[PDB]
C-alpha cells in the first residue's frame, strides 16, 4: 500500500496472509486473500499460476505482522487450490484473475471466528457501488514502488471507484480493462495498492453492509497519474464462486 495508514487485523479481520514454502525450507510472502466462509479464502489466480501445487502454501488468519506472530492467529494448510480456468495474461492486464483456497489446519479444522478472524460478505450479482464511491484496500504490499522490503505491519488505504467509461480511455488503460474488472484510484494519485497487495480485498459499504467488491489484480506502476489500480469485479463471478466452494 502506497500512502494510507498502518492498521491491525482487528480492522480487516477477514484478511488472509498467504505464504509459500520453498524446497530447502525458506518461506516467503505471496499474496493477500479474504475469508469468505470458515473453510474458504478468495484471492487472485496470478499469485499461484506459476506454482499451482497446494502443498507449497501456508495461510494465516488473524495476523497483523508479516514476519512475526500475532497473538490469536491461526495457521492453515491449503487442502485445495482452485484457479480460474479462463485465466489469461496479456502484458499485465490479467483476465479472470480469481482463485479459491480451501483451508485446513494440522488439526483438520477450518477458521474459528474471534475478535481477529471474521468473514466478509459477498456482493449481490451485478450490484456495485456508484463510481466516485470511496472503498478500502488492505495489504502487506510495498510502501513505495522503489522499495525492496515489504512493510512488517499491515496497511490500509482509501481509493475511489472509477467508471468503465473513464478507465477505457486511451490515456488510462484502453482495451486492457474489461467490464469484469473495476478501476479505483486516489484523486491526487497519491495512494494505491502496490506489488505484494495482489489477491487482497477491496471493500465497499453497500446498503449498510461491508462487501467484498473487488480483489487486487493489476496496474501499471503504483500511484501514477492516469494509471489506476485494477481489481477483479467480484459481483461478476458469483456463479463461479458458488460452484467451486462445494469442492
Amino acid at each position: 500500500i502506497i500512502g494510507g495508514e498502518f492498521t491491525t487485523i482487528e480492522n480487516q479481520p477477514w484478511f488472509a496472509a498467504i505464504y509459500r514454502r520453498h524446497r530447502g525450507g525458506s518461506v516467503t510472502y505471496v499474496c493477500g486473500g479474504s475469508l469468505i466462509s470458515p473453510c474458504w479464502v478468495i484471492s487472485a489466480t496470478h499469485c499461484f499460476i506459476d506454482y499451482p501445487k497446494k502443498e507449497d502454501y501456508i495461510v494465516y488468519l488473524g495476523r497483523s505482522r508479516l514476519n512475526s506472530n500475532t497473538q490469536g492467529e491461526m495457521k492453515f494448510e491449503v487442502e485445495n487450490l482452485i484457479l480460474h480456468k479462463d485465466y489469461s495474461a496479456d502484458t499485465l492486464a490479467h483476465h479472470n484473475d480469481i482463485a479459491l483456497l480451501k483451508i485446513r489446519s494440522k488439526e483438520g479444522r477450518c477458521a474459528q471466528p474471534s475478535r481477529t478472524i471474521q468473514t466478509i460478505a459477498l456482493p449481490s450479482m451485478y450490484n456495485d457501488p456508484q463510481f466516485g464511491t470511496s472503498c478500502e484496500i488492505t495489504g502487506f504490499g510495498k510502501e513505495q514502488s522503489t522499495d525492496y522490503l515489504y512493510p512488517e505491519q499491515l496497511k490500509m488505504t482509501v481509493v475511489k471507484l472509477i467508471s468503465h467509461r473513464e478507465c477505457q480511455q486511451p490515456h488510462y488503460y484502453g482495451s486492457e480493462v474489461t467490464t469484469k474488472m473495476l478501476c479505483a484510484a486516489d484523486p491526487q494519485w497519491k495512494t494505491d495498492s502496490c506489488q505484494g497487495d495482489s489477491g487482497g480485498p477491496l471493500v465497499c459499504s453497500l446498503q449498510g453492509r461491508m462487501t467484498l467488491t473487488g480483489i487486487v489484480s493489476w496496474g501499471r506502476g503504483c500511484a501514477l497519474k492516469d494509471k489506476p489500480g485494477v481489481y477483479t469485479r467480484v459481483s461478476h463471478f458469483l456463479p463461479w464462486i458458488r460452484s467451486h466452494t462445494k469442492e
Binding site: 506459476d50 495498492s193 506489488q195 489477491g199
Partner: peptide, 12 residues
C-alpha cells in the same frame, strides 16, 4: 515484476 500482476512468478 516490480508491480501488481507478477507476484510469485518464475521470471521475476
Amino acid at each position: 515484476c516490480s508491480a501488481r500482476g507478477l507476484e510469485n512468478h518464475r521470471m521475476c
